[PDB]
Design a protein around this nucleic acid. Structure first.
Lengths: 129, 87, 81, 184, 35, 150
RNA sequence: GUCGGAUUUCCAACGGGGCCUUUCCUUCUGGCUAACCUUGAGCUUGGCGAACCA
RNA sequence: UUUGGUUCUAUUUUGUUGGUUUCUAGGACCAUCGUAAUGAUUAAUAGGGACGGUCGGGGGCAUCCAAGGACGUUUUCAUUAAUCAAGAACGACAUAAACUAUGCCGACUAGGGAUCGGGUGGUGUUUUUUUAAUG
C-alpha cells in the first residue's frame, strides 16, 4: 500500500522532469510535501506550485523549471547528529558548492546549510540538486 | 563560473534549450537552431535581423518540437491562435 | 503535450473522464422530481434508484432498479432538480 | 430597547444599529418576531480600498441560523440605512491554543475550535448566499500564499460589489490574502 | 445533564417569546403588502 | 487491495464537495431524525436506511442533513444492535456456508471460502475488540454462531 | 581618523529574545518587594513575589 | 465567586498540663445552583459490508444449494491495512519444466487498434405493435 507519500511525490517530480514537462500533479499532499516544495522553491529549483483542495486530502500542481537535476527521498528517516550531516553530504551530493540535503529538525524542516547555521540536527528527509 | 577575483574561466559556456531549459551538449547532433526573420511594415524580411530558438535533441526526438515551437512562437507574439495553454 | 493547464482543463475533457479522475471528484448522478398520474404528490427520486420506489399515497411504482441508471415507468412527468 | 439587542458591550454605533434593529422590528409585521429573539455581540469597523467602510457584526454562534433565515432582507435594510457602508454578519467563535509539550492538559480541544476550522468558517460566513465550490492556494516564488476562493455562479448579484470588502475584512481578521473567482 | 436541560429551556423560552410576539405581528397590519 | 481475491477494481461513491447541502431540500432535521427512528423501529440495518432515505425522499447523506451520522443517533435513541451490521452479515453468511458444508461434504471450494469468511470474521472481531465496541473475551464459535444471528 | 593593525553614527545579511494580534507559555503560603502609580525642587517618603530563593 | 449536609486533621491561644467543645485554618466525601459556542476530524482513484441488473467451460449434488469478480451507487463502517517465521487448508501420499523459468502490495512514465464484462450518451441503425421500453 501507499506508505511514504513524500516518496511518491518526489518520484512524480523526478519522472515529470525527466520527460521534460513543465507541470506535474501530486496526490495526496501531506504537510511535509508542502514544506519540501517550499524549500525547493526558495532555492530556485521549481517555482510556483498550487494547492488544489478536495475534501479528502488535496492535490498539488507544480510548475517545473529546467533547473532540477534530481530530487529524492531517504527512507527510513535516519537519526542524524552533527557529524552525520557532512558525512551525508559527502555521501549523496554531487559537489561541495551546491546541492541541498533536507532534514526535519525540531525547529522545522530545512536544508543542511541553515541547519548548520542554526546549529541544530534531526531526522533526514531527502535531497535536492 | 568564476574563481576568486575576476579572470573569467569556464571556456564554452553552453547554449540552453528554449523548450525544456536544459543545456545542449557538444555532440548533440539532433539539436537545431531555428532562425526566424522578422518583418518591418512592408511585408519583407530584413537580412541579418532574427529571433532565434534552440531546440534540444530529446524534445525533437519525442515529437514535441512542434508543440513547443507553437508555444514559444505564440509567446513572442508572431503567432496568434494556434497553441492553447488549456489542452 | 508537455505544457498544459492542469488547473483549468476544458469542460469537455473534464466531463469526459471518470468521476474519480477529475480535478476534484464528484458524482455524475442527479435527483429528479417526478409527478405521477392521478394524485399530484411530487416525489424526489435519485437517478440510480436501487429499489422499487413508489408514491407514499398509493402503490404506483415509478422506477424499477437496473444495474446502471434505473428506468422510469411509462406514465411519469419528471424534471431535473 | 437598544440595550436589549446589544449583548454585552455598549458603544455608540452599536446602539445606533440597535435603534435601526428595533425600528425594523416594529415595522414590517411579516418579518416581526423573526428578528426579535436574536442579539449581536459586537460591531467592528473595517476600512477598504474603495473608501466605503464595513460593519462586521459579530453575533453568537448558536443564533446563526436565525440570521441565515432573514439575512438578505436585514442586510438590504442595513445597506439602505447607512450610506457608504457594507454590512457583514459573522459569528464570533473561540480559538483555543494548540497544547504544547510543557503545558498542562486542559481537556481535549474540539476540532471546531482550531484556527484553520474557524478561519474556513468565517470565510464561508463572509459569502453567505453563495456557496463555495472550490478553494486553491497560490504559493508564490517570494514565499507569500494567496488563497483563491471559487464561488457558485448562482445569485452572485447580492455580493458582487462587496468582494474587495470581503478581501479587506479577511485580511484584517486572519492576516491572509484571498482572491475571489466565479467559474462560469 | 444540567447543560442539555438549560439548552432546551432557553430554546423553549426563545420559541415561546417568538410565538408571543408573532401573535402581535399577525395582529398588526402590513402596509408593505398593500403598497 | 481485495485481500481475499485478485481484483483491483475501483467502484464506489463520490461524495460531493458541498458539505452543507443541497439548497433544494425543504424538510427539517427533526423530520428526518424521526424518519430514521421510525424506520429503524421495524428492524432495518443502517445501510438500508441510507439507501431508503436516498431514493424515497431527497436525502443525499444523513451526515450532511443532520449534524451527526446514522447509528450515532440510533445509539442515542437506544436502537443500536448488540453487534454491528458488517460482522453480523459476515457471521450469517458463515453459518449459511457451514449449513451448505454440513449438507454437502464434497463442496471443497466452499470449505476454502469458509476459511476466507472466518478469516474476515476474526479480523473484524479483533478490530472490534481493540476499540471495545465488543467486550474482551468475545469469541466466535460455530455453536454460538447458529444462535448469534438472532 | 594608527602607522600591513584597529573603531564608531551607517546602509545589508545571518542567526536570538520580548510584546500584540480570540494564543496560560501550572499556581498557594512567605519573604527582596522588583523593574516600584512610587517625583521631594531637577536622585525623593508609599505600586503587583521569583528577576532572588524557600 | 457560591449555597447544603457528611467526615478527618489541626496551631496560636482562652490561666497552666490533661478533658470535653465552638468559630476559624486545611482536607476528603455528598447534594443541586449558576459559567461556558457544552463536548464525536475527513470519508484517502485505502479496505470491509449492505443493495441493483448482470457475468462466468467457478464448485457440489441430482438429472436445487450457497459462493465470487467487475460494474453502478450523493448506502454503511471507520483505518479495520501490506507482507508474512510457527501453524493450517487445497494440491495433476504433499510431488512436477507446479513456468510468465519473471514473489506480493503501492505510485509514476510513449503509443495504437482489436476483444471480453459493465456503465454513460448520441433526435444514430434495425426488430416488435410502421412507431413505444427493451434487446
Amino acid at each position: 500500500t501507499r506508505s511514504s507519500v513524500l516518496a511518491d511525490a518526489l518520484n512524480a517530480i523526478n519522472n515529470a522532469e525527466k520527460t521534460g514537462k513543465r507541470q506535474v500533479l501530486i496526490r495526496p499532499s501531506s504537510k511535509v510535501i508542502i514544506k519540501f516544495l517550499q524549500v525547493m522553491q526558495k532555492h530556485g529549483y521549481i517555482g510556483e506550485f498550487e494547492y488544489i483542495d478536495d475534501h479528502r486530502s488535496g492535490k498539488i500542481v507544480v510548475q517545473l523549471n529546467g533547473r532540477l537535476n534530481k530530487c529524492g527521498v531517504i527512507s527510513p528517516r535516519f537519526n542524524v547528529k552533527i557529524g552525520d550531516i557532512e558525512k551525508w553530504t559527502a555521501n549523496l551530493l554531487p559537489a561541495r558548492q551546491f546541492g541541498y540535503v533536507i532534514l526535519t529538525t525540531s525547529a522545522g524542516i530545512m536544508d543542511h546549510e541553515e541547519a548548520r547555521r542554526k546549529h541544530v540536527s534531526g531526522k533526514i528527509l531527502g535531497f535536492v540538486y | 563560473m568564476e574563481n576568486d577575483k575576476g579572470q573569467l574561466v569556464e571556456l564554452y559556456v553552453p547554449r540552453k534549450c528554449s523548450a525544456t531549459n536544459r543545456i545542449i551538449k557538444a555532440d548533440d547532433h539532433a539539436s537545431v537552431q531555428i532562425n526566424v526573420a522578422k518583418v518591418d511594415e512592408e511585408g519583407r524580411a530584413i537580412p541579418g535581423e532574427y529571433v532565434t530558438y534552440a531546440l534540444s535533441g530529446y524534445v525533437r526526438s519525442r515529437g514535441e518540437s512542434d508543440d513547443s515551437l507553437n508555444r514559444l512562437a505564440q509567446n513572442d507574439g508572431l503567432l496568434k491562435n494556434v497553441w492553447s495553454y488549456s489542452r | 503535450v508537455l505544457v498544459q493547464d492542469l488547473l483549468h482543463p476544458t469542460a469537455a475533457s473534464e466531463a469526459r473522464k471518470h468521476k474519480l479522475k477529475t480535478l476534484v471528484q464528484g458524482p455524475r448522478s442527479y435527483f429528479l422530481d417526478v409527478k405521477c398520474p392521478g394524485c399530484l404528490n411530487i416525489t424526489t427520486v435519485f437517478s440510480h434508484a436501487q429499489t422499487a420506489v413508489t408514491c407514499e399515497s398509493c402503490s404506483t411504482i415509478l422506477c424499477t432498479p437496473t444495474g446502471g441508471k434505473a428506468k422510469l415507468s411509462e406514465g411519469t412527468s419528471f424534471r431535473r432538480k | 430597547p437598544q440595550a436589549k439587542i446589544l449583548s454585552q458591550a455598549p458603544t455608540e454605533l452599536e446602539l445606533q444599529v440597535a435603534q435601526a434593529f428595533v425600528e425594523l422590528e416594529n415595522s414590517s409585521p411579516e418579518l416581526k418576531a423573526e428578528l426579535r429573539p436574536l442579539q449581536f455581540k459586537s460591531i467592528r469597523e473595517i476600512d477598504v480600498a474603495g473608501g466605503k467602510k464595513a460593519l462586521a457584526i459579530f453575533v453568537p454562534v448558536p443564533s446563526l441560523a436565525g440570521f441565515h433565515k432573514v439575512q438578505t432582507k436585514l442586510t438590504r435594510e442595513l445597506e439602505k440605512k447607512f450610506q457608504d457602508r457594507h454590512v457583514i454578519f459573522l459569528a464570533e467563535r473561540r480559538i483555543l491554543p494548540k497544547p504544547s509539550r510543557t503545558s498542562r492538559q486542559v481537556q481535549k480541544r474540539p476540532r471546531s475550535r482550531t484556527l484553520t476550522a474557524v478561519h474556513d468558517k468565517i470565510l464561508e460566513d463572509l459569502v453567505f448566499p453563495t456557496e463555495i465550490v472550490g478553494k486553491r492556494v497560490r504559493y508564490l516564488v517570494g514565499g507569500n500564499k494567496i488563497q483563491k476562493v471559487l464561488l457558485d455562479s448562482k445569485d452572485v448579484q447580492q455580493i458582487d460589489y462587496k468582494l474587495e470588502s470581503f478581501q479587506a475584512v479577511y485580511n484584517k481578521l486572519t492576516g491572509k490574502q484571498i482572491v475571489f473567482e466565479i467559474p462560469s | 445533564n444540567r447543560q442539555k436541560e438549560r439548552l432546551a429551556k432557553r430554546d423553549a423560552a426563545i420559541a415561546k417569546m417568538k410565538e408571543e410576539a408573532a401573535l402581535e405581528a399577525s395582529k398588526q397590519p402590513d402596509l408593505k403588502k398593500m403598497e | 487491495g481485495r485481500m481475499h481475491s485478485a481484483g483491483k477494481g475501483i467502484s464506489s461513491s463520490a461524495i460531493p464537495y458541498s458539505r452543507n447541502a443541497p439548497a433544494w431540500f425543504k424538510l427539517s432535521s427533526e423530520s428526518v431524525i424521526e424518519q430514521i427512528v421510525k424506520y429503524a423501529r421495524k428492524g432495518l440495518t443502517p445501510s438500508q436506511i441510507g439507501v431508503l432515505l436516498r431514493d424515497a425522499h431527497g436525502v443525499t447523506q444523513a451526515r450532511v442533513i443532520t449534524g451527526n451520522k446514522i447509528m450515532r443517533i440510533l445509539k442515542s435513541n437506544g436502537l443500536a444492535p448488540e453487534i454491528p451490521e458488517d460482522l453480523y452479515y459476515l457471521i450469517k453468511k458463515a453459518v449459511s456456508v457451514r449449513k451448505h458444508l454440513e449438507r454437502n461434504r464434497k463442496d471443497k471450494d466452499a470449505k476454502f471460502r469458509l476459511i476466507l469468511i472466518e478469516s474476515r470474521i476474526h479480523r473484524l472481531a479483533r478490530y472490534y475488540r481493540t476499540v471495545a465496541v465488543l467486550p474482551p473475551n468475545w469469541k466466535y464459535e460455530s455453536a454460538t454462531a447458529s444462535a448469534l444471528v438472532n
